[PDB]
Each structure stands twice: as C-alpha cells, then as structure tokens.
Amino acid sequence: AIAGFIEGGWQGMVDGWYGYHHSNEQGSGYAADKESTQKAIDGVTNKVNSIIDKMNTQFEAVGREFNNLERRIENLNKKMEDGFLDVWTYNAELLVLMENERTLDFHDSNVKNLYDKVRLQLRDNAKELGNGCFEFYHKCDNECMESVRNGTYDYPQYSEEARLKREEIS
Amino acid sequence: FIEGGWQGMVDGWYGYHHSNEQGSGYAADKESTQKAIDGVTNKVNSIIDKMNTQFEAVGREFNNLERRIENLNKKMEDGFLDVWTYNAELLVLMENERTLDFHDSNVKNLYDKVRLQLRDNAKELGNGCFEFYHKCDNECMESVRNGTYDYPQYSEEARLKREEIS
Amino acid sequence: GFIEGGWQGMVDGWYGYHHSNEQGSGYAADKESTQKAIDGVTNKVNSIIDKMNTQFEAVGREFNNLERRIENLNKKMEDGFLDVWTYNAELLVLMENERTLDFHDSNVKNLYDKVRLQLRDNAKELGNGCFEFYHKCDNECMESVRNGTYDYPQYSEEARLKREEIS
Amino acid sequence: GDQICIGYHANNSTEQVDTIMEKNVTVTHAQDILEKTHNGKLCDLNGVKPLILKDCSVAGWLLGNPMCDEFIRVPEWSYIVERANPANDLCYPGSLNDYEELKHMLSRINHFEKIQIIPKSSWPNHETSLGVSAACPYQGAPSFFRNVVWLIKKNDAYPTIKISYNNTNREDLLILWGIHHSNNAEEQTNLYKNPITYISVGTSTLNQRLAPKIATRSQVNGQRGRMDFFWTILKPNDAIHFESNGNFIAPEYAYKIVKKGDSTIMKSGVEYGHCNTKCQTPVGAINSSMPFHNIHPLTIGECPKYVKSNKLVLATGLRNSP
Amino acid sequence: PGDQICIGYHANNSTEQVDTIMEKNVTVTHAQDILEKTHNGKLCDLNGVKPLILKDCSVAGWLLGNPMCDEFIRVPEWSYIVERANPANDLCYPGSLNDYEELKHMLSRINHFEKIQIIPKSSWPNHETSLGVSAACPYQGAPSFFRNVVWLIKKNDAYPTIKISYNNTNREDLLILWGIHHSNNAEEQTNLYKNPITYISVGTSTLNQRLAPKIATRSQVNGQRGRMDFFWTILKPNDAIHFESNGNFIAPEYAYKIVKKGDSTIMKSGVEYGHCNTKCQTPVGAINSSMPFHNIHPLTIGECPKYVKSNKLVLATGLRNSP
Amino acid sequence: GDQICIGYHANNSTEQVDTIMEKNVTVTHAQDILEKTHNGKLCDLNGVKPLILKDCSVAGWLLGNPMCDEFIRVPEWSYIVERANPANDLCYPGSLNDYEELKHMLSRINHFEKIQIIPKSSWPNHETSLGVSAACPYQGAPSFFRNVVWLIKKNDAYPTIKISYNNTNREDLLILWGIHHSNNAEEQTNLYKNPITYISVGTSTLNQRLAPKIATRSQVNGQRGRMDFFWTILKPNDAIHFESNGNFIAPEYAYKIVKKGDSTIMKSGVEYGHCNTKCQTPVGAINSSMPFHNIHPLTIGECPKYVKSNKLVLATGLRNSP
Ligand SMILES: *[C@@H]1O[C@H](CO)[C@@H](O[C@@H]2O[C@H](CO)[C@@H](O[C@@H]3O[C@H](CO)[C@@H](O)[C@H](O)[C@@H]3O)[C@H](O)[C@H]2NC(C)=O)[C@H](O)[C@H]1NC(C)=O
Ligand SMILES: *[C@@H]1O[C@H](CO)[C@@H](O[C@@H]2O[C@H](CO)[C@@H](O[C@@H]3O[C@H](CO)[C@@H](O)[C@H](O)[C@@H]3O)[C@H](O)[C@H]2NC(C)=O)[C@H](O)[C@H]1NC(C)=O
Ligand SMILES: *[C@@H]1O[C@H](CO)[C@@H](O[C@@H]2O[C@H](CO)[C@@H](O)[C@H](O)[C@H]2NC(C)=O)[C@H](O)[C@H]1NC(C)=O
C-alpha cells in the first residue's frame, strides 16, 4: 500500500496523515480524512505510551560493597547485573524492531482501507489506474468529489449519468 | 464497511445472512469459525504451555550481619519481578492486537470467498452484502455458503435485471 | 485464499507466474517481489541473531558446603534467567514464524491483484488464482503482464468483441 | 434483488481487554492468565507434610528446650514453618554456631531420628544431675536442655574427660555440644574447680579448640552466663573425640539424618489444612496452570512467575458491539 | 482527459531514521526515542534528604574521630553516603575495623544520628588519659589521636584492672566503638601497660567478646609497627555494656544515637553537590525522566529506568517519509 | 482458452516449524537458531591455554604435592581445569585457609613464576630433612610437600625462628606457610622440644598468631595429626616477618603473580584438543554466532544464552504444500 499503488507521498498534504487528491475540470486540491487519521495518531500515541507506562520501577541501591576476600560474592553480583542488562537490552531492541514494523504496516492498512472504500463507492463509474488515483468517467463536481471524501455519495445521481459518459466514446 | 456484528448468530463466529423470496435468515460457516477456534486456543495454550517452571524455595535465610547478601538477593528478586511484569503486560497487549486483527482478516477472506464465485452474477453493495442479479433460492444460498456456486446457471438472468432496468 | 496448491516446477525464486497459451506452457519467477522477501526474512533472521549482547562470563560452583545459602542464591538466579530466556526465545520464534508465513501470503496476493488491476476487463478470473484471457494473447503479451507493461488499448475494442458479443 | 451478507457474532458481554493501541475494548469472550486465588492454608508439599514448629525455634527443638513440647517424631518433612518470633529458642542465654546454615540443611530432610549415643552412665567421675538452671524450667523445677548434659564437678574435682564415639549407623549423625562461659573466677571454681579450662573436639574433618570467656555480661532470662552450642555431621564409620576439663556441655542424644533434596524455611501464622499442593505461599497454596501470579513472592515449590499486576486478560473472541 | 481522485499519505522534511525487524535505515515523518541519556551532572538529594558527603574521609575515619576528618556531624539524617574512590583519611594509626562493610551498609541511610559522650575522661582516675598520642595521627603538626576514643596508658607504673559499665538510658539504639592495641614487643607492653599478659572483655545481653593482644613483628605503616583493631556493637535501649581490661584498651568516650528505617548503599563519586532533588541518582549525575530505559551508569541509587547497552531506541510514530 | 496464473514455491522439504496459532507446519526453507553442537574438547580461550591439573587439586599443585607432577612452568592461563574429585589434594590431612577465594583468584593469571625466597640452607640450627611423612610417599618412600619445609628440632634444640623476607621483585608475591598440630605432649616435644609454641606472621596488613591444637583426632591417610596452611599476597617492597618456636611449616618458594582478568574453575574430564574458542563448556567448545544454546549450563567465555529447548526453528521459506 504505502509503497504499492501509491508510490510516493504528498508533501502538500499537511492537514493530516492520510487523505485524498482531486483533479477535475474546475480545480486540483488535496484533502484529508480526519477520521482515519485521528485513530492513527491516537493509536500511535497509545502504542508509545503503552510501551513506556507499563514499566515497573522500584527503589534500588546499587554499589560495590564486597571486599577483596569476597570476590566470589562480587562475581555473583556481576553475573546478576550483567545478566539483567542483556535481558533488558535484547528485549528493548527487538521490541522496537517488531513494533516499528507494526506502525509501518498500520499506516499501510489505513491507506489501503481508504482506497478500498472508494473503489466500492464508485464501482465502475471510474477507472483503477494502479497508482491509487481513480480515473472518473462521469465528470465529478466538488460536491460530487465531497460525496467521495466524506461518505455522502448519493449514487442514484450518476447511475444513469455515467451510462451517458461511461461507454459512449468507445 | 462491514459494520455492526449480528446478535442473531449464536452458533459460530463468522457466517452469512441471506434475504430472498422464501425468507431471511442467519447461517454460519463452520470451517472459518473452527479454524479460528483451533487457533486462539492454540495461542492461549502456547502462551501458557511454553513457560518453564522449576522447583524453587524462596525465603530469608541471612542474619543481621549478612545484610549485603540480603540486598543482593533483593535486587535479584525485584529484578525478575520487573522483567516478568513488563514482558507479561506487553505480551497481552501485543497478542490482543494480533488476536483482534486475526478475526478481521478471517471475515475479509470469507467476504472475498463469496465474491470469487458470484463474480458478475451479483453486485457489491459496499456494506458487506451482495445484491444478486438473479433469483436465489435457499438451495442457491447454500450453494454460496458451501462454495459450490454454479456461475453458468444464472449468467443470463443476471443481464435481465442488469441492463434492462434503466 | 486465491492461490491454492503451490508450484513445484518454479525453482528460480519464491513467487512466480504460469502461462499456458497455444505457443507454449511453462512457469516463471518474479524478481522484485521475491528478492524483497529474501532481504526481509534474511534481515529478520539476522535481527534476532545480531541484536544479542554477549559478554565474558565465568560460570562455576565455587561455594563450599558451609556456603549453601549463597550457593542456592546462585541457583535461583541461574534458573530465573533460564526461565526468562527459554520463555522469551520460544515465544519470539512462535510469534515471528506466524508473521513470516503471513508475509508470504501478502506478497503472493499483491501480485495477483497487480494482474487484476492491469487486466481490467479482458479476461475472467478462474477462482483458483488464474485469469482466463477470453481475448487473444501472445507469448510477448505474457511478460507485458509480468513486466507491468500490459496495454489494454492493444485489445481494448477486442475486449468488447468478446465481452458483449459472446452472449 | 436477492441479498447475501457477511458478518460476525455479538453477544451480551461487558468483558473488556486492552491492546497496544486501544484501551477498554469490549470483547465477546476473554480469558485471564494471571493466578490470583489461594486456599488460605499451609499444605503438604508434593505429598510430604511440612515440619511445623509452633512456638519453638530450630535451636530449641534440636537441643531439647524443656519449655517446648517433647519430640513428636516426624521422620521426614518437605519444609519448615516457623513463627516470626518463636517464643522458646534458648532458655539459657547463648548462641548456636552456624545457625542459618544448619537451618538451611534441615529445611528438607528425608530421614530424621534421635538416638542416644552417650548415656548418663558414661560420666562416673562427674555429676550429671546438678546441671540445671531456673532459666530452663520443667514442671516448675530447675532443668536443662533435654539432649545435652551440663557436667559438674564431683568431690570438688573435675578430672579430665576423654570420651570418643564411633558412628556405627549407616546414616549421617547430627551431633550437638556446647561450652559454658562463667561470670567470675569464683563461679568457675564452684562448678569445675579448674581456673583455666578447655574443650577439644576432633573428628576426621573437625579440629576445634574452645576456651570459656569468663566476663561480666547483662542478665538474660535471669542469667549472666552464656552457652554457645556447636554442631557437626559425623559421617558413617567416623569417630568424634572429646577432651575437656571444665565448662563442657556434653551430648546425650544425636540425630540420624538423611538428606535428598533442598528447601527453605517459611515464616507464617496460617494453620495446616490437610491437603496437597505443588506450590505453597505463607498466606496459602496455589493450584493453577497459569504462568503468572500475584499472591506472594516467598513461594516454595513449582510456582508461576510472580508479577506486579491485577489482570492479564487475553482476548479470545471478537470485538463485541451492543 | 478525465477527472481523478487520488489516495495518499503525508510526507515532510524529516531526517529521522528507524530500523524495523525486516528493514534498516527507514526514514519516517515522526519518531520518538524511549532511551534516556541526559543527567544534570550534580549530586542531588534523594527524595528530599541530603546525602552524607564525606569529603576526604572514609566511614571508619569519620566514625572513630580521625583528627583530620571534621567533627560536628552536621547532617542528622542522610539518604546515602558519598565516599571518594580512595579516601585519604581512613585510619591514621594502622589497624582494622571489624565488620567494616556491613557497618558501612547500615550507615548508608540513617534516620537519626547524634553523637553523645557516654564515658567522660574523668572516669579514669587511676589511668593516664592524655598520653595516648601518636605521630601517626597528627593534628596541626602536633601528634594526636582519634577523637571519639581514648588511648589509656599506665599511670605511676601501674595499670589497675578496669571495670566499667554503661546502661544506655536513651530511647534510641547506640553505636559504640572500642579497640585493642597490638604492641610490638614485651617491653612496649610493660612501658605502656605494665602488665605482661593482658585481655579485654566486652559484654552485653548479646555480645560476649574476649580479645588478647598479638605481640609480633609487622611492617611499618604510617611509621608505626603496632596495630589497633576496632570493634563495634549496637547497644539496645535499657541494655548495658560492660568493659573489663588490664591493658591495651582503646576505651570509648563518645557513642552514636542511631535510628534506621530504610536502607541504601554507598556511592563512589567525586562530582559536586548541587542543591537539587531527584528520584534517581548516579555517580556522574542525577536523572529526571519517565523513560523506561537509560544508559548513563549502572551504579544507580533510587527509582531508575533499566540500564541497557544501547545508544538509541527510536520508535516509529509517523509515516514512511519519501523525498 | 489461454490463461495466466499466480503461484509460489513447493520443494521436497519436510522441515517443520511452529506458529503461535498452528503446530507442525511444513515449510520450504527454515533455520534453527539454537546451537546444539560442540567439538567435545577443551580449548584455548582467546589464544590462551588453560592450566589443566590432571590428578591434582589446586592446593596440592601449589604446595607441591609429591604425587602431583613437578611444577611444569605455565606462564599464563585463562581458566583452570580440575577433576570432580581430585585424587591428590592434601596428602597430609589438614586445610588451606580461604581456599575457595584463593582458587577464584588463581582461575585466570597473566603471569605466574615460582621463585625461591627462603632456601633450605637458611636453617643451620633446625632440621630440614626429617620433616617427612608416610602420608606423602614419593617413589614408595616417605616424603612431604615440595614447596614448604617441615622444620624439626636439631640436637634436641629448637631455637626461636626470626626470619623476614622483603619483596624485591616488581610483582605481587603469593606466599604459603603452615602450622602442624601435634597429637600428644610426647610427640610435640619429640619434634619441637617446646611444649607451648606459637607462630607469628606479620606484614603491612597481616597480623597472625597461631598455636598448635594438641588433641585427639581421627586417622586420615594414616595420620591423626593435621597441617593448616595459610597464604597472603605480599605487595612489592613490603616485607613479611615470621617468628616461631615450634610447629612451623616454613616456606621455601613463593609465586610471582600478576592478575589482570578473572575466570572460574571448570570441573571436567574431557581431553585438551589443541584448539581455540571464545566459549568453553565442560563437555566441549562452542563455535557459534547463534543467540541460544542448550549444551551445558557451566560455561566460560562469550557464550549464547543457555535455554531449555531442543529446537528453535525459524521459518524462512514458504508453506510447502505436497
Ligand atoms: C568404627 O567401627 C567400625 C566397625 O567396628 C570400624 O569399621 C571397620 O574398620 C576396619 C578397618 O579398621 C575394617 O577392617 C577391614 O575388614 C575387611 C574385611 O571386612 C578386610 O579385608 C580389611 O583388610 C580390613 O581389615 C572393618 O571391615 C570395618 N567394619 C565394618 C565397616 O563394619 C571403623 O573402623 C570404626 N571407626 C573408627 C574411627 O574407629
Ligand atoms: C624493602 O626493600 C626496599 C628496597 O630497599 C625498601 O624500599 C626503599 O624504602 C626507602 C625508605 O622507605 C626508600 O628511600 C627513599 O628513597 C627516595 C628516592 O627514591 C629518597 O628521596 C628518600 O629520601 C628515601 O631515601 C627507597 O627508595 C626504597 N627503595 C625502592 C622503593 O626501591 C623497602 O622499604 C623495604 N621494605 C621493608 C618492609 O623493609
Ligand atoms: C539499665 O537500667 C534500667 C533502669 O530502668 C534497668 O531496667 C530496670 O530494671 C529493674 C529490675 O529489672 C526494673 O524493676 C525496672 O522497671 C527497669 N526499668 C524500667 C524503666 O522498666 C535495666 O535492667 C538496666 N540494664 C542492665 C543493668 O543491663
């Protein structure tokens, strides 16, 4: 999705994280779907917190308190301190790597979901170009464009109107 | 676009709802629900059965002139407390995400499984339901849930409702 | 899902295509999709290996029979770390194995749909992961589907000569 | 036209679980993997009853504190249950050398039996009946520990003691003995007649010399004198050799002892309840297959991993919608 | 020439890179590091309690009253002790302190600490209390001795057997220190204590100690071949301590009222106190953070994140940036 | 009709992996990340040979046990290999003070060199030849520890010993001495001529005073007597001072010792194999980059994390369908 049908990424879309781009005979502008975004930032913020806020911290005093005739006991403490370091280091590294993917696949899914919703709203009164953009037949007004972005698509309007543009010049 | 979740389905997890001339009813797909129930029970069994438990004897055997060794054991005890607490809480959070999306994927694959048989014989309503372009009995309804839909037997009747209705 | 079975005959990659036109029948192997998968699982395997911090540690039993309390303290630590490492490793393999397998499923489907969005209406899906080209096709036309250079306008009107004409 | 739909199952369900990106998500079915329940009793550990010292410490029980109850023989036990502050530990003020290491070894014992090794008939030239104190009373009369004998001079003489004992049993022997520290030179002469005394204890591995530390001390249990007790494990066919000329607390009884496994000592006030468990805590026992619990950190047995949490709820069903 | 509706995501000018389980060096729009690497560089109070900062003195030199180690205690309560790696003023007269390390552990966090004189110098009328002075413990260039104990010497060529007692009429535990002087030969024994064979007896409800001097040949440390071994005990309220000796007795003069509720450790650090507060202290600086991990120092004192061997733990929060 | 297809790989592989939701899933390619193989030999640790005592314990090798082979000069080692129960520990019964700490310090040594610090010629008034016992035979004849001298009275005289040694070397010196405990008063005077004796050892740190413990003990290796050995690290330019009038086991050799890193003592019977490794186990060496292993818990070096598993198989290939 993210590097699939859509290949790049819009620097002009500063309103949100996911959104649209319309290009008709009266304009060419960007827009966002504040619904699909706000779940991502809220969820992403939740993920970052859930990782931080679930750590239990307790008061501990760490020092070197064994003399030269207690090296075995100090070695016992070294194995413990080192052992806990490797446990926390390995878990932290893999947690970030595994969760960093999940954020990227999370952003993958929401974009594909927005694309899939439009694909069924328009059925075959538009064309799948493979770049994510949809090639309209029926000619779409900004009101008609809005009916796609925020779902208000009164499909009865262009049901027959598409027929008068869809298969005509063929 | 598959919104809600039917309360009338009290047999399985994933299923169908048909509405034809004979009536409207609910039905379940036994395989997808099973494949799911074999799976999550494996997931919960794996989380439980993969834990290695050994016999241990935890006490306080050091006197008042061995408080440094007592502090050593304490740091060891709270160290494993933090490790096990942190891993446990995150594991439930991560697998609960995995479990939920597992149900989401199953319902989507079942949605496509119907589509791959209907093809152009039926519409897509954009809400999880398909509008048939022909007349469908409960026999044909069971032909769709089973996975034995006959595309040729309703191809022409599809066009009678498709192009004639202007 | 769509692609049920699995081709032995393909040996040049991980995902591939099959063509059965009248000029010949044979298999093929993708490169861009398969290679991106080779790096992903090789890095995923390497991420699990290379991220492990290893230090010099000398493990022994150097407490006598009058230090059994301290010796038991060592045993509790050694068993505690074993329980942590055994549990974390076993679940790490189980969790990543399920996603590695599903990674293959996603990659294969994202090639089936790539054909689907390139074919438009010139062919009928077979339901088994195949597209019955009811129009005319060529061996050179076969790679244009795989190359991503398939051109509907070549058989554009020819599609209507087979779509609405064949009733 | 005719319609066919795809959907999922919903029910009545107020159960909520948490995900990494969402909070308080209602589900159809859910399962907790965190153990939170215990029976509130102390139980047998894998079939073997514990050794429950009610108001006695291990030191008092081994030496035979008269104020403690008499030996109700328990040949084997899986762990020791002790009170936080046992009432009767050492009726005569003193100490027991290597107490914690001794307690750790006695935590789990397969076979335990008290045998007389040196009867009171073996001290013809010393008085074996005047070694009593008000700090160790029995039936209102002055007494002493019931497994060791406080030897006193007879006819104003303390001839040198030279007695050996050979462990002819097939099992290890737990042997205990002590030394008495006087308060002044006068007290030393009234009891042992010898101004300067010593104790020698020799085995195949033990080579010990003791001297009484006669000095001024505070009054404990009405006594300013002290008695330090020492112990050892006599392996089979080995011998222990005692030599002394005063201040010697000789053994009468010893303990045949066999050790197979290890355990610890549990401090608890809960009562024994005639049941079995694989996992015991000072507040109760755990019967669970769950990998985590939050009941108590001081567990004994094969137990779940102690964690600091209230609920580890995994999602098994779907996302419920009312 | 038809109309188009497109689907896409947000991109920006971010250089932030994150690594995933399958890809490395992936630029993202937004990111957050959960690793903590910042410390204020100062010694701070732990939960409102000022640490006991011994400047150039060790705990043993501070307790016994090393003449070069500052009196007056100042802090009646401290959260942790800051010693230097190799304190200069440990024990001017060579010897040892029994159970020093457990004693250091107990004094790491003290709720109340007050020095009260228990045995004044006037309580030794038959002995010499002013000649127990060595060049090993100098003060203002002049030879001196430990402040909190008194080195008793014979007077008029006689050392009467000392028998003294102290009842601890306070409501708090008392830390008492005493010592034994090991001579170098039998003549030093007579020239200092007049009794060829000597002993020390200390008794409480729980303490039964008898020591004898060990006359032997040792090396010179701080120009001294003799040694002095010091001992300590905690005298519970209403419990009494009894001293008996006839030579080589380093008698106590001052003791310490001590109350201990919590426990801590001793930190080795040279960096300067900075009039601050913190919940986590390290020898190089204090940590104010909520992050779950850090890599500042392993020898932490307080409520701290988990120490790791890592330079970066960057979580990807935003989208996949593409230029 | 001509059609195109989408598909994947399927080889002959029977390799099986497990997923969190499914068990025994056959795959085309997969990789195991659990190390299970070892070469079965003891190796060098980062190009340093271990010090391997064949039949000897650390104490016997240090003190010069006659049955233990002569001191093969080992300038350095990374760890020490002992057997489970070394045959030649201490031929004369006794003990070595702080033995376990001494063993721990000696586990890894950067430079080790034996030197003579008090030669036998330095005892004109004491007998350096009859300190020999049947408990330590050499070639079927009575002998004694080689690196210490058992001084006996000469001409019915044991003059008080006063010897001091200054560490003029640039490295730390490990010095061992001992005291012999007599069995009775007649034996004490038959060897030392003085009934009441002592030993005084002094350095900048050490302040030691010992006396013999003449008493009755069990017969070990044919001897009812005992020898207690001690040790200290003499810092450079420091001097040790000895004084005794009997029962003195004087040193002849010390040990120039330089310690940089630390290790432990490995108990193994495996044979050395002229190899090199980063990780060593008592059953063999591990040459690996894998993160987990299940070979042996007692490892030395940089090793994978020990776990309880027989497989850790990561699926790298696709689902192989036959
Ligand atoms: C404690 O008493 C036991 C039994 O009285 C002593 O064990 C006995 O020790 C002697 C050696 O001194 C053993 O003699 C051996 O007998 C075998 C034949 O059985 C013979 O072939 C050998 O050459 C040797 O003479 C004797 O068997 C053994 N008796 C047993 C084990 O029942 C033990 O020595 C005494 N310990 C002390 C410290 O006094
Ligand atoms: C063991 O023998 C060594 C070597 O003889 C002794 O070390 C020496 O100690 C003296 C005095 O402590 C040092 O003298 C000083 O030398 C400096 C010049 O470096 C000079 O400026 C001073 O005024 C003073 O004369 C001498 O340098 C030193 N030799 C060394 C370190 O090689 C050591 O004292 C002896 N130890 C015992 C316990 O006998
Ligand atoms: C220290 O002095 C106190 C003085 O109070 C002694 O305690 C008293 O002991 C007598 C006799 O046992 C009792 O009648 C008093 O009631 C005690 N005082 C209180 C306040 O209860 C204490 O025994 C002395 N400690 C010694 C001598 O070791």
Side-chain angles (χ1 to χ4, degrees), chain F residues 241-281:
Chain F
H241 312 259
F242 294 102
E243 172 158 341
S244 153
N245 67 329
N247 305 67
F248 185 30
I249 310 285
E252 217 208 12
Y253 300 98
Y255 291 105
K256 293 166 59 154
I257 190 152
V258 186
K259 185 183 177 63
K260 306 251 76 163
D262 210 334
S263 159
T264 194
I265 285 187
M266 173 171 344
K267 303 290 214 165
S268 180
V270 182
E271 195 177 306
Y272 173 68
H274 310 110
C275 38
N276 182 36
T277 185
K278 337 190 316 293
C279 178
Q280 181 74 67
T281 89

Side-chain angles (χ1 to χ4, degrees), chain A residues 2 8 10-11 13 16-17 19-21 23 57 60 62 89 93 96-97 100 103 107 133-136 139-140, chain E residues 2-12 18-19 21 30 299-300 302-303 309-310 313-318 320:
Chain A
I2 274 175
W10 306 332
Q11 296 262 348
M13 218 214 83
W17 277 2
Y20 313 87
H21 183 25
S23 214
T57 88
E60 310 291 358
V62 198
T89 292
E93 293 291 341
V96 171
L97 296 208
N100 272 6
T103 325
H107 295 336
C133 302
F134 279 107
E135 191 75 65
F136 273 129
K139 206 267 159 287
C140 191
Chain E
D3 308 349
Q4 292 179 0
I5 183 45
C6 301
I7 297 270
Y9 44 56
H10 167 76
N12 61 354
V18 308
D19 294 55
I21 183 92
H30 324 315
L299 295 190
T300 89
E303 217 170 310
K309 177 153 140 223
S310 284
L313 298 171
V314 167
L315 276 164
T317 84
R320 270 207 190 202

Side-chain angles (χ1 to χ4, degrees), chain B residues 4 6-7 9 12-13 16-17 19 48 52 56 58 61 63 81 85 92-93 96 99 103 128-130 132 135-136, chain D residues 2-10 18 20 29 100 104 264 289 299 301 305-308 313 315-317 321:
Chain B
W6 311 329
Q7 318 240 342
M9 266 219 309
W13 283 352
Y16 307 89
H17 176 79
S19 74
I48 294 178
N52 185 65
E56 302 294 343
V58 185
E61 318 228 339
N63 60 51
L81 200 277
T85 278
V92 194
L93 290 196
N96 277 347
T99 325
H103 296 309
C129 303
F130 301 88
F132 271 105
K135 304 312 206 87
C136 217
Chain D
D2 304 354
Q3 217 158 128
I4 186 70
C5 300
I6 301 305
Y8 46 97
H9 159 37
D18 268 283
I20 197 160
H29 335 305
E100 303 88 29
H104 187 76
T264 190
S289 38
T299 72
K305 296 301 171 303
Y306 185 53
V307 295
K308 186 243 173 188
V313 203
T316 50
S321 191

Side-chain angles (χ1 to χ4, degrees), chain D:
Chain D
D2 304 354
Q3 217 158 128
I4 186 70
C5 300
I6 301 305
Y8 46 97
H9 159 37
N11 52 353
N12 86 348
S13 209
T14 66
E15 287 90 45
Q16 324 177 354
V17 303
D18 268 283
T19 66
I20 197 160
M21 324 200 68
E22 267 175 276
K23 299 265 156 202
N24 286 359
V25 183
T26 305
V27 309
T28 80
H29 335 305
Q31 183 138 80
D32 194 325
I33 55 165
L34 173 70
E35 193 43 56
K36 327 176 280 141
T37 88
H38 69 91
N39 64 17
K41 316 270 154 132
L42 307 172
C43 328
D44 300 347
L45 185 52
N46 280 314
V48 183
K49 211 215 244 183
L51 176 75
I52 311 84
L53 313 182
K54 333 282 182 180
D55 53 357
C56 214
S57 76
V58 179
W61 173 57
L62 289 180
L63 295 166
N65 201 340
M67 333 184 44
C68 286
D69 306 4
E70 200 41 46
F71 206 90
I72 317 289
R73 195 205 173 185
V74 177
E76 79 245 35
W77 60 85
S78 46
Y79 60 106
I80 284 136
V81 171
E82 215 202 8
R83 270 323 282 124
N85 258 36
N88 323 117
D89 168 70
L90 281 187
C91 50
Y92 200 97
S95 64
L96 180 47
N97 204 67
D98 293 336
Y99 191 33
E100 303 88 29
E101 281 290 312
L102 172 61
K103 288 208 277 182
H104 187 76
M105 170 200 93
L106 289 180
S107 35
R108 172 154 181 220
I109 294 301
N110 196 322
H111 192 69
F112 200 74
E113 178 29 28
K114 136 152 92 160
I115 52 191
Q116 189 196 57
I117 57 161
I118 316 192
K120 271 169 290 195
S121 71
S122 317
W123 322 100
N125 302 324
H126 302 75
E127 182 67 25
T128 88
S129 298
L130 293 205
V132 292
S133 167
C136 307
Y138 180 70
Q139 262 162 1
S143 191
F144 196 67
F145 300 92
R146 305 177 101 52
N147 298 317
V148 292
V149 49
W150 186 354
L151 301 177
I152 305 269
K153 60 172 203 182
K154 186 205 283 192
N155 312 308
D156 205 8
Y158 200 110
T160 303
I161 288 160
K162 291 198 208 52
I163 173 146
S164 320
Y165 169 84
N166 178 351
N167 181 20
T168 45
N169 308 101
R170 78 178 281 210
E171 297 112 348
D172 287 9
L173 250 61
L174 173 56
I175 314 186
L176 286 122
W177 73 95
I179 188 187
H180 172 242
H181 311 288
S182 315
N183 304 318
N184 45 59
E186 203 256 323
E187 197 198 12
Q188 178 75 7
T189 64
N190 313 355
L191 273 47
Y192 319 110
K193 180 58 170 54
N194 294 323
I196 311 108
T197 64
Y198 69 99
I199 293 180
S200 303
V201 156
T203 72
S204 96
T205 61
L206 186 53
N207 176 27
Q208 170 197 64
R209 205 110 194 284
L210 302 168
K213 289 166 292 173
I214 306 164
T216 302
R217 306 163 209 87
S218 289
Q219 200 144 226
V220 179
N221 301 319
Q223 312 305 325
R224 323 211 172 68
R226 299 288 190 278
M227 290 186 173
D228 302 320
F229 288 98
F230 307 79
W231 62 275
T232 186
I233 293 300
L234 195 58
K235 309 215 78 60
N237 276 334
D238 192 19
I240 181 149
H241 312 275
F242 299 90
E243 177 162 335
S244 176
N245 56 344
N247 316 74
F248 182 37
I249 318 300
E252 180 159 320
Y253 296 90
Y255 297 100
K256 269 151 68 166
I257 169 176
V258 169
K259 195 162 171 62
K260 149 149 39 194
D262 265 282
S263 167
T264 190
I265 298 96
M266 178 179 289
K267 316 284 253 154
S268 158
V270 191
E271 67 158 277
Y272 178 67
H274 306 73
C275 38
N276 190 85
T277 189
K278 90 159 66 202
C279 175
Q280 184 70 41
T281 89
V283 308
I286 300 167
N287 176 27
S288 173
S289 38
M290 297 304 135
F292 310 104
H293 84 102
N294 61 344
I295 291 119
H296 202 283
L298 303 174
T299 72
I300 301 178
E302 320 144 341
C303 297
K305 296 301 171 303
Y306 185 53
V307 295
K308 186 243 173 188
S309 170
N310 309 350
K311 268 294 189 174
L312 281 297
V313 203
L314 280 167
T316 50
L318 301 98
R319 189 190 299 245
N320 196 19
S321 191

Side-chain angles (χ1 to χ4, degrees), chain D residues 217-219, chain E residues 165-169 205 237-242:
Chain D
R217 306 163 209 87
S218 289
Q219 200 144 226
Chain E
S165 200
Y166 176 80
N167 175 270
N168 185 15
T169 57
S205 68
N238 272 302
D239 183 28
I241 181 169
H242 311 260

Side-chain angles (χ1 to χ4, degrees), chain A residues 68-72 86, chain F residues 98 100-101 104 231 305:
Chain A
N68 71 359
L69 257 204
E70 294 158 328
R71 280 334 170 172
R72 286 166 311 141
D86 299 89
Chain F
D98 300 344
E100 289 68 31
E101 290 281 310
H104 184 73
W231 62 278
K305 302 297 170 297

